[PDB]
Amino acid sequence: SCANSATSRSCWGEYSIDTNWYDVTPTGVTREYWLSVENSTITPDGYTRSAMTFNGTVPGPAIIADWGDNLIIHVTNNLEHNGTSIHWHGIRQLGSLEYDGVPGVTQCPIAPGDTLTYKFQVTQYGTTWYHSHFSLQYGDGLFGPLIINGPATADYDEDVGVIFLQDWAHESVFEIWDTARLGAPPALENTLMNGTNTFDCSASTDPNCVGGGKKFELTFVEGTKYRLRLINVGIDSHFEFAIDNHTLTVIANDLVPIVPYTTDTLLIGIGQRYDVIVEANAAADNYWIRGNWGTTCSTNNEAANATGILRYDSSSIANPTSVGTTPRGTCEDEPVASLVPHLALDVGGYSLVDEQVSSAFTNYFTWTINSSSLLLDWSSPTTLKIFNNETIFPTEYNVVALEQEEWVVYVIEDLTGFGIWHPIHLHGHDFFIVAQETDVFNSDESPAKFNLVNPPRRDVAALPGNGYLAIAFKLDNPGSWLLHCHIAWHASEGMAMQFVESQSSIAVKMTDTAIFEDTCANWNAYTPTQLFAEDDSGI
Ligand SMILES: *[C@@H]1O[C@H](CO)[C@@H](O[C@@H]2O[C@H](CO)[C@@H](O[C@@H]3O[C@H](CO)[C@@H](O)[C@H](O)[C@@H]3O)[C@H](O)[C@H]2NC(C)=O)[C@H](O)[C@H]1NC(C)=O
Ligand SMILES: *[C@@H]1O[C@H](CO)[C@@H](O[C@@H]2O[C@H](CO)[C@@H](O[C@@H]3O[C@H](CO)[C@@H](O)[C@H](O)[C@@H]3O)[C@H](O)[C@H]2NC(C)=O)[C@H](O)[C@H]1NC(C)=O
Ligand SMILES: *[C@@H]1O[C@H](CO)[C@@H](O)[C@H](O)[C@H]1NC(C)=O
Ligand SMILES: *[C@@H]1O[C@H](CO)[C@@H](O)[C@H](O)[C@H]1NC(C)=O
Ligand SMILES: *[C@@H]1O[C@H](CO)[C@@H](O)[C@H](O)[C@H]1NC(C)=O
Ligand SMILES: *[C@@H]1O[C@H](CO)[C@@H](O)[C@H](O)[C@H]1NC(C)=O
Ligand SMILES: *[C@H]1O[C@H](CO)[C@@H](O)[C@H](O)[C@@H]1O
Ligand SMILES: [Cu+2]
Ligand SMILES: [Cu+2]
Ligand SMILES: [Cu+2]
């Protein structure tokens, strides 16, 4: 039993970095939050535009808690013309399926003017984020940081918090969706680093291009070790984060602490999080912070300006003249060999489920999973079906039923030919990356090459373009769990499926059943006169 501190980050009282947090949870306290989903106007980069925000800021307010705390988060939808539904990214929701926030799966949408109070315990610690999982809303700024304090696998003095990395349009994503769904995502007008960037409005005739955008700035005190919590939250952005003339000691991936490793740059797919410790041991100077936008992965109009500024002297106003490390320049994830959980777990005996991604064109460009593109009915979410004792779901719900062989290995194959590295997010579980391969899956040979012995473990991992991703998870969380590409266009285009896991073992408190019913009653009251119908997959 030791206290967490700058020289004992492994400690968490009677618990520690060695505690199995899948099986053991500290007692904490209840923390209550009130969030308002708003229709806003912001100027993050000297361009004024609309946004959909929590509480009028991009990013939204920080939700900060300790490992074990119970969170009560009242979410009121103050948009006029969209439902909304908020997901707590990577959060296991063991026994709280109905608060996972996936509209069409775990809830009906929150109708305009309605409130839904999300309740869940945090049985994980580290860096994550919360965001709307209702259509493309997070692309208009509807996300915020969710930081759960706990132990760490390397010592550090100061936690600077999250640095968000994203693309950023100069108009609502909902304005460009009709063009994007023809099949080619647009190059967006800029990027943001923790909510800010420069933009040259000097030659603009657009009255909204008011200028004054500023670089993200981070100040170091020489000798201090800083925890930076990196999240890629773009619509369709890949990053390779780096700080010139500094080394990153990587200590967590998503919500899983790893054996520290050092790296000059850090590949980060959408929805992925890393925790790094940077020691401020360079010559004191201004250094460029590089997002290293992956131009081979997706387009942006201003890729080279996905940068911020590290200062050792905060009174300096000069731009860095530092020289960047040459990026690997791929759309890959960090190498599997680098991502070794500190808490070592092995994958047990399993049953294999194989699915294949392709594309089709119906009304617009769609992605298919075993020939079916996800299309959900917001007024009949999977959980509603489950509470009605339905076990056969619509084809377009892309349900795979799991029932106990205590483990599943889920192989998803890219048969599209496109060579996109798709960030695949699984809800309700950390998975084990048993293979992440650039090659064709062979059901007779590939399983023999799976790594079942402490493989990487996280909640978002790349399906390699033209390859396969084999992820294992244990049947330990009855529910209906969405799995999808986190490239927002692709999710909206149906690149998703869901696991209905141990359906008959789902338990929901009567109070939460009543709440769920109320949410859907209110949604159903809104839809007859909504201005805008569902026009994508729902998620
Ligand atoms: C959620 O609310 C947003 C409003 O904030 C809705 O966005 C609207 O979406 C419609 C349908 O896609 C857009 O119409 C299209 O606009 C483009 C661009 O001018 C045009 O080329 C198309 O032919 C079509 O008219 C509309 O622009 C857009 N409105 C705004 C202000 O962005 C969205 O549909 C809502 N979704 C739900 C599910 O309630
Ligand atoms: C990126 O932008 C956000 C601001 O949009 C910064 O978020 C800030 O993060 C820090 C550290 O995690 C938060 O500090 C904590 O505040 C709470 C509540 O009062 C307190 O309990 C803790 O002791 C700690 O001071 C801070 O709340 C938060 N600010 C906002 C507005 O949410 C973040 O720091 C930026 N990243 C960098 C590297 O600058
Ligand atoms: C968010 O905004 C709403 C509406 O004004 C308010 O009730 C709530 O307290 C605010 N929450 C935070 C965290 O500021
Ligand atoms: C947000 O406000 C804008 C400007 O009034 C409006 O055009 C748009 O429909 C609103 N969006 C939603 C989702 O309510
Ligand atoms: C998806 O299709 C492939 C190829 O036909 C088949 O091998 C696999 O079992 C299918 N998966 C499921 C879950 O239906
Ligand atoms: C679902 O099954 C349970 C268990 O038998 C039963 O109590 C409940 O009423 C059922 N509900 C419906 C709507 O079929
Ligand atoms: C993470 O660790 C692996 C194995 O040592 C390296 O191959 C990689 O480049 C990174 O350091
Ligand atoms: Cu997410
Ligand atoms: Cu994708
Ligand atoms: Cu998701």
Numbering used by the authors: 1 to 404, 409 to 543
Publication passage describing the model:
Laccases are members of a large family of multicopper oxidases that catalyze the oxidation of a wide range of organic and inorganic substrates accompanied by the reduction of dioxygen to water. These enzymes contain four Cu atoms per molecule organized into three sites: T1, T2 and T3. The substrate oxidation takes place at the T1 site and molecular oxygen is reduced to water at the T2/T3 site. In this work, the laccase from the ascomycete Botrytis aclada was studied, which contains conserved Ile491 and nonconserved Leu499 residues in the axial positions.
A comparison of the structures of BaL and L499M BaL shows that there are no changes in the structure of the enzyme except for the region near the axial mutation. The specific activity of L499M BaL towards ABTS was lower than that of BaL over the whole pH range and was lower for 2,6-DMP at pH < 5, which is consistent with the lower potential of the T1 site of L499M BaL.
